[PDB]
Structures are given as structure tokens and as C-alpha cells.
Swiss-Prot record:
Subunit architecture: Interacts with MYO2 and SEC9.
Protein name: Lethal(2) giant larvae protein homolog SRO7
Cellular localization per UniProt: Cytoplasm; Cell membrane
Keywords tagged on the record: Cell membrane, Cytoplasm, Exocytosis, Membrane, Phosphoprotein, Repeat, WD repeat
Bilayer disposition of the protein: Peripheral membrane protein
GO molecular function: GTPase activator activity; myosin II binding; small GTPase binding; SNARE binding; syntaxin binding
GO cellular component, one term: cytoplasm
Gene Ontology biological process terms from the UniProt entry: establishment of cell polarity; exocytosis; Golgi to plasma membrane transport; small GTPase-mediated signal transduction
């Protein structure tokens, strides 16, 4: 009933599925990340983010930004899509005649080279949506190995300084090809004589070998090239003479020389090479190689290796031996240990100097997408990994690193907005696009989101995209507060919205308290230093932050993991431990005012308290309101405590009673409302101050069990209950206002419920008359569904999966403005001049070719004008 309620999704957070591939455009300075189900997220400065969903739900293999206005996306079905960063829609879909095994594009060119399984190479005109007549047959079969198996094209790359030359690798031969002269310029075939050790994974060292090629790359100067093979061999060649300069691996050289008495001196089990990147610094004369390794076993066997080659000797005055010396004695080699044992699925360097040199021009950061969906960021060349949420839009923080817990709360905008105004994100990395202003009409309450991570970090921000809320956020790190590096996974979180206080529990059982406030402005700190349970960590506050969530106390009970926590809005914090202990702390102090193991009080077989809540209402029938701490146990028991203002501003704790309320344990949600006004009875400072008035407010407490809800009156026996067909995921009370008369404001208190399978319901209380019944529109993960939070205005924040959350509204009538999108493409940004062959490095030998001339070669003299408005715009 009630035309008042209607289910609608208001917002999405994180990603609807696992990230699988990424790309970056230097010119527009935008980051694109694609998922396993065909969605493409494009990010820019601050919170700029646009999502484009492909018709096909197939996974994305590769993406490239071209001409600064197009995004080329290729899915698993070898279907090529071309997206417009100008109109934010798909411009064309193309099915490729064959299996795509390699490609290459260039930010300044309209052409994409495509290698196929059959070893052929075709060229596609991205700008005019047409295939070129230019096609290459399998050169390996026709010119080098006719009797060999039909080889596919393993890799293709545009010559860094000459758009008219391309580097092509087949399995057993690599070669440079001139599109202008239409002929093979040079070839390179890596052969090992008998007794040559070869790469770490080389087999039958006794015979002659031609180890398959897995990748080919041009040296930034374009005069040398490297070929990497299956045995892990790294071979450097002079691109013009074809002379093989030197063959080596990460640990040795002269691997091409026969050594019948060779013995592998390695205390490190080899890791097969996955991919290689040739980087260069601001000044192209300095370069380095970044190498990734496919794991063996399954334990952190995925580290990155960097070989800094330093200054490249001048080509014209360096002998082959000089060059061999250059490659044999790197300026430096360092291994970058990956924080995780999870396999890397995609590596993307983030260029800082220009879009050239295959997008590796002075990258100060490397983006990594892991098989589990986590996204890592490693500073280059330092190798320092960072999880600073502030570096990218907040929606990406759900991935860096994955959230282990989360919640949402209705917070009063009064002080909330003041805190956000002073917390704008001023140090994000991306610069592209413009965030479209989406001003949200004022409200007394806003929505705060809070996430915990395996990292030990906790992110805090507003779920809205308003002027002040959109780009504001806070991040607190327990690794600092605790001077710890392992065992930091956030287990539970409690956020007191009225006093902006925070309680964080970690996997060890320790709990740290924080509070939004002004800040005070050793390396030996350890919780085990003192014998006290309350450890002062006030001085462990973040250095340069004038204000924010500052730490105060660390709770070191040494009582195991927590079973429940609740930072009240009245200075008290309740903490329960799986082992049975129950603790009550008064922030005024701070001090522990109560601590007993509830197992010695249970009438049932209660092992621990599974839920804690603070209320101010009449206990039983004593005629006045009291401060009551209500606790639900894993066995359906409810324990009620009275918190009484005592002498010297302290408080006494009095156990009122323990009652076995339901066989549907455990109790995981507690709430309350007044019997007459049906307004919230959760404890608040103003309510606490009113105690001196001696008012009496009888109320009803809601006890949420496994699959049943109990309505009870504290201190009384009578009650009611409502059972559900499916287990309950989350419940909560909502307070709504409905106009109807002439300007009459009639409020309504409803309870909203979410079952673990995704079904959502709204009921009026205490009669429990259903007002709405609908299922969430998509599959939801049982694992995270229980983190969901019902909000004060009828909204509900739901965690759908490991990387996704959605905000839903249940109240139909709402002040909704038509959806709007951010701007991605910015006009007038000039794409720099591509590097050219240094007449100073290799004078002559090259054949200058302008893009105009390349366009004629590949497109023909009568190349049509494109049908895209984007073609002319991009000039
Ligand atoms: Na926001
Ligand atoms: Zn349903």
C-alpha cells in the first residue's frame, strides 16, 4: 500500500564487476578502467567519472586512447569498439576477420595495426571507420620458416621516432618493416648453439635452440631493439645492422655462449617472464626496463624487476662491444616486492612527460590490476606502493585496497558540512575533464559512508555529489596509530554521527578510537609496552593535518576478536568480545567503567554479545527515562544495563536484567522508538541533558534476530514479533515527513528490512503492516549484504559485492533532477610533437614520413572524409 513508497537506485559506488584492463591518455590526462562484464569507467580530476556500458557483457582485453578524443576498446570476442570522449557514446562496432593476437596504436595517428592468429597484419582506420587495403601475409612462413607451423603475430610496435617503420615479431623471427618502402628492413633470429645455457627456463641445453619470441620492443633511441623469449632470454639487437649485441637474463650474461660445464648458481627459483616495458626519463637519453614475472607455486612469486640502463652511449661513436658493455653492467638493478601474492593481470605506466615512447615517457607511477580485482599503485622508480585514497576519485578507493567492512550513517549537516568544507581533495593525480556541478538542495541530514580495508585504513566521506560534499573526504591509517605493518584488516566499524566519533576494530581484537577535532599541531611505540588495556595514542596523530579524525585511545584487551562495538553519541563506547568479555568505556577520561564476561550471567548458552545499542527511555515501569545500554547475544538473549550519573561527574553501571528473547539467535540489530510519538530513542547528548527534567518516555525496542524481529518493552514481559521467510540481512527505522492537507506536515515512522537474498520490505510499526515489497534489481553477494545500512530518510546503503555498493531510496516522492554527465573532452589541448630520428644519433638511413603522407599510404589518395564530428574537432 501507500503510494508513498517506491524502490529506486540513487547511486553506485566502486565497480559493478572486477576491473580487468586499463588505459591512460596523456593529452587529456584521463584514466580508463574496464571490467569483466563490459563496463568502461573513465576518470579525471577530483571526482570526474563517466561510465560507458557496452552492449555485449563480454570482458575487455585492451584499450587505447587515440587522437585524444577516441577510446578504442577490444573485448574477448575480438570485437573492436570505438568510443567518443566527446559524445560519451559508442561510435562504431567492428568484428575482426580473424583472431587478434596483438595490436598497437599511437596517440597522434588515426591508424591501428592488427596482428592475427594466422600471422597476417591488417590496418584499421579509427578516424574514418574503414579497413586499409594494406595487408601483410605471414612473413615468417614465406621468408624464414616455410616448413614451420603457421605462426601468429606475437607483437607489433610503431617505431618510436619514425611512423613509417614497424617492429613485428613472430614466434621464431622478428623484423622491422617499412610501410613507405613496402619491404622488410631487417630481421633478427635468436639461435642458441649446443651447450649454450640460454634463459633460466631453457631446456636441453645440449642441442641447438630457437626459443619462441613472446615480445619485441624498440629502444627509446629507436636504434636498438630487444626481443624476449620463452626461456626468459633478453636479447638486444642493433636495429639497423641486425647485429646481436648481447644475450642475457636478469642474473647473468653471455648466455648465448656454449658452456658445457655450466651450473645454475641461483638460490632463487626462476619465474617466467610475463611482460616487459622499456621506460625512459624526462630526458629520453636515460632509460630502464620494467619486468613482470608469471608465478610458480602461488606465493608472492610475482615481484617486479627494474634494470636502470642509465645514460645511453651515443650510437655513432660506440662500438658493439661498447654497447654490449652498456647492457651487461646496468646502472642499477632493484627488485620491487609486490605487497601481495595475487597474480598481476595488467600493468599500466602513467606517463608524465609526453604520450610517446609507447606511453612510457617518464612515468612516476605504475598502475597494477590484480587477478582478485584489487588495484595497486607503485611509485616509479622508487618502487614504493601507495594506497592513499586521495590520489584518485573516491569510487576507486573501494579497490585500493579492497574493503573488508563498511557502513553508512545519517549525519546532521550542521557540523558535518563545516568539516567537509575544510577537507576538499586537493592532491588527486589526474587533471582531465570537468566535474559537472550537481547542486543538492539543502537538508538537515546528509549521508556518510565509511569503509574499512585489509590495509588498516578507514575512508570517510559524503555519499552525495553536492557542491561541498562531492570532493571532500578523510582517511585515517591504523598502521601509523599502531606502528604495525601486518594484521591490520579492519574488522568492524562504528560511527557516531552526532558527535563525529569513530571506533575501529581490527582482526587482532584491538580497537582504536578517533574523533573529529583540532590536532596537536616515536618509532618504538607498541601496544605491548604498557600493561594497561587503554593505551594512549594521542601523540600518534598525523603530522600536517590541522584537523580531522584524531586518535586518542587504543584498546588492548588481549581478549581475542570483537563480537560487537558501538561508539555511542553520548561519550560511551561499548565493546564485546567473541570470548565473552563486555566492556564499557567513558570517553570523558577516558576510562573503563564496566568489564565482565557475559557468560557468567547468561540464562541460555550465550557465548558473547553480538549487538550493542544505547538508548534513553523509560526502563520497565519506573516513571522516568534512563540511559540504557541494551545488548543482544548470539543465543537470542537481551541484557539491559542502566548507566547512572554519579558523583564527581562519573557514571555507575547497573545490570537491570537479562532475558532470553528469541530462539532465532544471533541478535545483530537493535533499534528503538517512543510509544507515543514514535520518534527515535537512541541516546543523544540533548536527550541526556533532558534527564534532569525528569520526563518519562516509554518506548519499544526492536530486536533483529536470524530471521525474526522482536518488539519488546524493556523491563516488561509482554511483546510481539514478526518472522521472515529468508534470513535477515539488515533492518532499521526511518523517519519520513509527508505533506497532504493544506501544508500539514505529517511524519511517519517505518521499519525497513532487507533479507540476505536481496528482497526489501517496508512496514509501519508497531502493527507491522507491509507498505512495500520489492526485490533489489540485481544479484547480491551474501557475504557483503549484511553490511547494509538503513538511513534516516528511507534510504538504504547496500554493499552488492566486493567492489560495489548502491544507495537506494524507498520514498517515491523525491527532489530528483535529471541525471547529468561530467565533461571528458577538453577543447584546445595541444598534442605535442612526436620524437623524430636524431640526425645527431643516426644521421641518414631514415626516411622522413609525415602523418599526411602516412594517411595517403594506408588510406589511399581518395581517402574519404570521416563521418565523425570528432575527426575535425580533434585538430
Ligand atoms: Na562525495
Ligand atoms: Zn524477492
Amino acid at each position: 500500500k501507500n503510494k508513498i513508497f517506491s524502490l529506486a537506485e540513487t547511486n553506485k559506488y566502486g565497480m559493478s564487476s572486477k576491473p580487468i584492463a586499463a588505459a591512460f591518455d596523456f593529452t587529456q590526462n584521463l584514466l580508463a578502467i574496464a571490467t569483466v562484464t563490459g563496463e568502461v569507467h573513465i576518470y579525471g580530476q577530483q571526482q570526474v567519472e563517466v561510465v560507458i556500458k557496452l552492449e555485449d557483457r563480454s570482458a575487455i582485453k585492451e584499450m587505447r586512447f587515440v587522437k585524444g578524443i577516441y577510446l578504442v576498446v577490444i573485448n574477448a570476442k575480438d570485437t573492436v569498439y570505438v568510443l567518443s570522449l566527446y559524445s560519451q557514446k559508442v561510435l562504431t562496432t567492428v568484428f575482426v576477420p580473424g583472431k587478434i593476437t596483438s595490436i598497437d596504436t599511437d596517440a597522434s595517428l588515426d591508424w591501428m595495426l592488427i596482428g592475427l592468429q594466422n600471422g597476417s597484419m591488417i590496418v584499421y582506420d579509427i578516424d574514418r571507420d574503414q579497413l586499409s587495403s594494406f595487408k601483410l601475409d605471414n612473413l615468417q612462413k614465406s621468408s624464414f620458416f616455410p616448413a614451420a607451423r603457421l605462426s601468429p603475430i606475437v607483437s607489433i610496435q610503431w617505431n618510436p621516432r619514425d611512423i613509417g617503420t614497424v617492429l613485428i615479431s613472430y614466434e621464431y623471427v622478428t623484423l622491422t618493416y617499412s610501410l613507405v618502402e613496402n619491404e622488410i628492413k631487417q630481421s633478427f633470429i635468436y639461435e642458441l648453439p649446443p651447450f649454450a645455457p640460454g634463459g633460466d627456463f631453457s631446456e636441453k641445453t645440449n642441442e641447438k635452440r630457437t626459443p619462441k619470441v613472446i615480445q619485441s620492443l624498440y629502444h627509446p633511441n629507436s636504434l636498438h631493439i630487444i626481443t624476449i623469449h620463452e626461456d626468459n632470454s633478453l636479447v638486444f639487437w642493433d636495429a639497423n645492422s641486425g647485429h646481436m649485441i648481447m644475450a642475457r637474463t636478469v642474473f647473468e650474461t653471455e648466455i648465448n655462449v656454449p658452456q658445457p660445464d655450466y651450473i645454475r648458481d641461483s638460490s632463487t627459483n626462476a619465474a617466467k617472464i610475463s611482460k616487459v616495458y622499456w621506460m625512459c626519463e624526462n630526458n629520453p637519453e636515460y632509460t630502464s626496463l620494467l619486468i613482470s614475472h608469471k608465478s610458480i607455486s602461488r606465493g608472492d612469486n610475482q615481484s617486479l624487476t627494474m634494470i636502470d640502463l642509465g645514460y645511453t652511449p651515443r650510437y655513432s661513436i660506440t662500438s658493439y662491444e661498447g654497447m654490449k658493455n652498456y647492457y651487461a653492467n646496468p646502472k642499477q638493478m632493484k627488485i620491487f616486492p609486490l605487497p601481495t601474492n595475487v597474480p598481476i593481470v595488467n600493468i599500466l605506466p602513467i606517463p608524465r612527460q609526453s604520450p610517446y615512447f609507447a606511453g612510457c615517457h617518464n612515468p612516476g607511477l605504475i598502475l597494477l590490476i590484480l587477478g582478485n580485482g584489487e588495484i595497486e599503485t607503485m611509485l616509479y622508480p622508487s618502487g614504493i606502493f601507495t594506497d592513499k585514497a586521495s590520489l584518485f576519485p573516491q569510487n576507486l578507493s573501494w579497490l585500493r585496497p579492497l574493503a573488508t567492512t563498511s557502513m553508512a550513517a545519517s549525519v546532521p549537516n550542521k557540523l558535518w558540512l563545516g568539516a567537509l568544507s575544510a577537507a576538499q581533495n586537493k592532491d588527486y593525480l589526474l587533471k582531465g575533464g570537468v566535474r559537472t556541478k550537481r547542486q543538492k538542495l539543502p537538508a538537515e541530514y546528509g549521508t556518510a559512508f565509511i569503509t574499512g580495508h585489509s590495509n588498516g585504513s578507514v575512508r570517510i566521506y559524503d555519499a552525495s555529489h553536492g557542491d561541498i560534499q562531492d570532493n571532500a573526504s578523510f582517511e585515517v591509517n591504523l598502521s601509523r596509530t599502531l606502528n604495525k605493518a601486518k594484521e591490520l584488516a579492519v574488522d568492524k566499524i562504528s560511527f557516531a554521527a552526532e558527535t563525529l566519533e569513530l571506533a575501529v576494530s581490527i582482526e587482532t581484537g584491538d580497537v582504536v578510537l578517533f574523533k573529529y577535532e583540532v590536532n596537536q599541531f616515536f618509532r618504538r611505540f607498541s601496544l605491548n609496552n604498557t600493561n594497561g588495556v587503554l593505551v594512549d595514542v594521542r601523540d600518534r596523530a598525523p603530522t600536517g593535518v590541522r584537523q580531522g579524525f584524531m586518535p586518542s585511545t587504543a584498546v588492548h584487551a588481549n581478549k581475542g576478536k570483537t563480537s560487537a562495538i558501538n561508539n555511542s553519541n553520548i561519550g560511551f563506547v561499548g565493546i564485546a568480545y567473541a570470548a565473552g568479555s563486555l566492556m564499557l568505556i567513558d570517553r570523558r577520561g577516558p576510562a573503563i567503567i564496566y568489564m565482565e564476561n557475559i557468560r557468567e550471567i547468561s540464562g541460555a548458552q550465550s557465548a558473547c554479545v553480538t549487538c550493542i545499542e544505547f538508548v534513553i527511555m523509560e526502563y520497565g515501569d519506573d516513571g522516568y527515562s534512563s540511559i540504557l545500554m541494551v545488548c543482544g547475544t548470539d543465543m537470542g538473549e537481551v541484557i539491559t544495563y542502566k548507566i547512572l550519573p554519579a558523583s564527581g561527574g562519573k557514571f555507575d553501571v547497573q545490570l537491570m536484567d537479562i532475558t532470553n528473547v528469541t530462539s532465532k539467535g544471533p541478535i545483530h540489530k537493535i533499534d528503538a522508538f517512543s510509544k507515543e510519538t514514535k520518534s527515535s530513542c537512541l541516546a543523544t547528548i540533548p536527550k541526556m541533558q533532558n534527564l534532569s527534567k525528569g520526563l518519562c518516555i516509554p518506548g519499544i525496542v526492536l530486536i533483529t534476530g536470524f530471521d525474526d524481529i522482536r518488539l519488546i518493552t524493556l523491563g516488561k514481559s509482554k511483546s510481539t514479533h514478526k518472522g521472515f521467510k529468508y534470513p535477515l540481512a539488515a533492518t532499521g527505522l526511518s523517519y519520513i515527513s509527508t505533506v497532504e492537507k493544506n501544508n500539514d506536515r505529517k511524519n511517519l515512522t517505518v521499519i525497513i528490512t532487507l533479507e540476505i537474498n536481496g528482497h526489501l520490505r517496508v512496514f509501519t510499526i508497531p502493527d507491522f503492516k507491509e507498505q512495500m515489497s520489492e526485490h533489489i534489481p540485481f544479484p547480491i553477494a551474501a557475504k557483503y549484504i549484511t553490511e547494509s545500512s538503513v538511513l534516516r530518510n528511507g534510504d538504504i546503503a547496500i554493499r552488492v559485492s566486493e567492489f560495489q555498493a548502491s544507495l537506494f531510496s524507498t520514498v517515491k516522492e523525491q527532489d530528483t533532477l535529471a541525471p547529468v554527465s561530467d565533461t571528458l573532452y577538453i577543447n584546445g589541448i595541444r598534442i605535442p610533437y612526436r620524437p623524430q630520428v636524431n640526425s645527431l644519433q643516426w644521421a641518414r638511413g631514415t626516411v622522413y614520413c609525415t602523418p599526411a603522407q602516412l594517411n595517403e599510404l594506408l588510406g589511399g589518395v581518395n581517402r574519404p572524409a570521416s563521418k565523425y564530428k570528432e575527426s575535425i574537432i580533434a585538430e
